[PDB]
Amino acid sequence: HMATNVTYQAHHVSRNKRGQVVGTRGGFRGCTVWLTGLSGAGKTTVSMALEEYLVCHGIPCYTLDGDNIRQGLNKNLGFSPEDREENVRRIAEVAKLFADAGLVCITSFISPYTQDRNNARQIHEGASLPFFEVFVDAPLHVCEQRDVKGLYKKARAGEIKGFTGIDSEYEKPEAPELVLKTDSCDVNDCVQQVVELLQERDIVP
Amino acid sequence: HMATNVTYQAHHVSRNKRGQVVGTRGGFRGCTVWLTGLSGAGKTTVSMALEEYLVCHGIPCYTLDGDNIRQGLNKNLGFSPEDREENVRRIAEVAKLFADAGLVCITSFISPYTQDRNNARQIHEGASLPFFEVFVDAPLHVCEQRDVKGLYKKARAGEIKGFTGIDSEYEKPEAPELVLKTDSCDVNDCVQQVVELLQERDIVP
Ligand SMILES: Nc1ncnc2c1ncn2[C@@H]1O[C@H](COP(=O)(O)OS(=O)(=O)O)[C@@H](OP(=O)(O)O)[C@H]1O
Ligand SMILES: Nc1ncnc2c1ncn2[C@@H]1O[C@H](COP(=O)(O)OS(=O)(=O)O)[C@@H](OP(=O)(O)O)[C@H]1O
Ligand SMILES: Nc1ncnc2c1ncn2[C@@H]1O[C@H](COP(=O)(O)OP(=O)(O)O)[C@@H](O)[C@H]1O
Ligand SMILES: Nc1ncnc2c1ncn2[C@@H]1O[C@H](COP(=O)(O)OP(=O)(O)O)[C@@H](O)[C@H]1O
Ligand SMILES: [Mg+2]
Ligand SMILES: [Mg+2]
Secondary structure (H helix, E strand, O other), X not given: OOOOOOOOOOOOOOXXXXXXXXXXXOOOOOEEEEEEOOOOOOHHHHHHHHHHHHHHOOOOEEEEEHHHHOOOOOOOOOOOHHHHHHHHHHHXXXXXXXXXXXXXXXXXXXXXXXXXXXXHHHHHHHOOOXXXXXXXXXXXXHHHHHOOOOHHHHHHOOOOOOOEOOOEOOOOOOOOOEEEOOOOOOHHHHHHHHHHHHHHOOOOO | OOOOOOOOOOOOOOHHHHHHHHOOOOOOOXXXXXXEOOOOXXXXXXXXXXXHHHHHOOOOEEEEEHHHHOXXXXXXXXXXXXXXXXXXXXXXXXXXXXXXXXXXXXXXXXXXXXXXXXXHHHXXXXXXXXXXXXXXXXXXXXXXXXXXXXXXXHHHHOOOOOOEOOOEOOOOOOOOOEEEOOOOOOHHHHHHHHHHHHHHOOOOO
C-alpha cells in the first residue's frame, strides 16, 4: 500500500509550450480554483457557472466536482474523516495534473478540513501552480433551508450519518483567496468575483 | 468505503464547446491513448515523445505515467495485484476526465491485467470517449537487457519482489488497437505509428 522503487519520469514539453497549445489565448494559465464549503453553499453552482464562463471566454478549464468524482475515481471512498482526507488528497493530485496540463482546474468539493486544503495547496505550490482557495460561504442555516438534495433532512432524522455541518466537522477557511457570500449574491456575481480574482492573478487576461 | 448519497452534477459546457476552446485546431478530440507493456518495453519513451509530438502539432495532451502517478495520486498503492488493479482503475478514471476535458490523455502504465485494461476501456466507452490500447511490445529478454532503472537486476536477485515479468504476471494484449514493436523500431517510428492510428481515428487531422 505504498509505491516503492518508482522513479520520476520527466515530460519532454515545457510549461511555456503547453501554454502555447492550450486554448486560443496565449500564455500558460494552469491553476486550481479550489472551492470549499458546506453542502448547499453553492459550490457546484459556482464551479459549473465558472467553467461555462471560462470556456465562453476562450479558457480551457475543467470542473472536478465532489459528487461526480465520488461516482468514479473516488467511488471507493465514504465520508469518515479518513475517507474525506483521501478523497481530497486524490483530487488535489488530479487537480494538479489538470493545472500542469494548462487547464484552469476548478474543484467543488466540501473539503471540510483545513489541513487537507492546505495539503492540496502545497501540492500545487511545490509544482509552481497557482492555487486559489475560494470559500463558498453560506450560513449553515441557509444551506439547510436550501436542502437541495434532501440531505440535511435525512441527516437531521439520523438517516445519513456523518453529514458535514450536522454530524461531521466543517473547518471554516481562515485564509482563503476569496470568500463568496452566496446567500447575498447571485451566481453570476459570484462568478464575477472569481473572475476578478483570476484577472488579478494573471490567469484570466 | 463506498460513496453513498451522491448525485451527478451536470456540466454547463458541452463536448462541442470544449472542442472549440481546447486547441487552436477546432473540433473535440478528447481520447485516451493507453499504453501497456513490460517494464523497459518503452512506454514512457513513447508516451513522452507522443506528448511532445502532439503539443508540437497543436494538440493539447497530457501524459499520465505509472512511475509519476505512483508518486502523487497513487503513492499509497504498491504492486500487489489488487493494488495494481486500484492503480489502473484510478488512472482510467483520471484519463476519462482528461479526455472528457478535450485533451489527448496518454497513459504509460504497465497495466499488466487484461481485465483492468478492459475496465479502463469500458469507462471510456461509457463516456463516448475514444480509447486506444497500445501494446508496447518488446520481448522480456530485451527489456531485461535494457534495464535502465536496474529493476530487473534487482528483481532477479529478489531485491524487488513481485516485479512484472519476473515475479508478477503480464497478460499480453490480445486485441490492442496498435502494437509497438520497440525492439525493432526507434521511438520516432513508434511515435509515427501512434500518430498514424490517431489520424485513422480522426484524433489528429
Ligand atoms: N455525509 C456526507 N457529508 C457530506 N456530503 C455528503 C455526505 N453524504 C453524501 N454527501 C454528498 O457528497 C457530496 C460531498 O462530497 P465531497 O467529496 O465534496 O465531500 S468531501 O470533500 O470529501 O468532504 C455532497 O455534495 P455537496 O452538497 O455539493 O457538498 C453530498 O451530495
Ligand atoms: N514490482 C514492480 N513491478 C513493476 N514495476 C515496478 C515494480 N516496483 C516498482 N516498479 C516501478 O513502477 C513502475 C510500474 O508502475 P505502473 O503503475 O506502470 O505499474 S502497474 O500498471 O500498476 O502494473 C515501473 O515502471 P516501468 O519501468 O515504466 O514499467 C517501475 O519503475
Ligand atoms: N450566489 C450563489 N452561488 C451559488 N449558488 C447559489 C447562489 N445563490 C443561491 N444559490 C443556490 O444555492 C444552492 C446550492 O446548491 P449547490 O450548487 O448544489 O451547492 P453545493 O455544491 O455547495 O452543495 C443552489 O440551489 C443554488 O441555486
Ligand atoms: N522504441 C525504442 N527503441 C529503442 N530503445 C527504446 C525504445 N523505447 C524505449 N527505449 C529505451 O529503453 C529503455 C526503457 O524505456 P522506458 O521508456 O523507460 O520503458 P518503460 O516506461 O516501458 O519502462 C530506455 O533506456 C529507453 O531509452
Ligand atoms: Mg455540490
Ligand atoms: Mg515507464
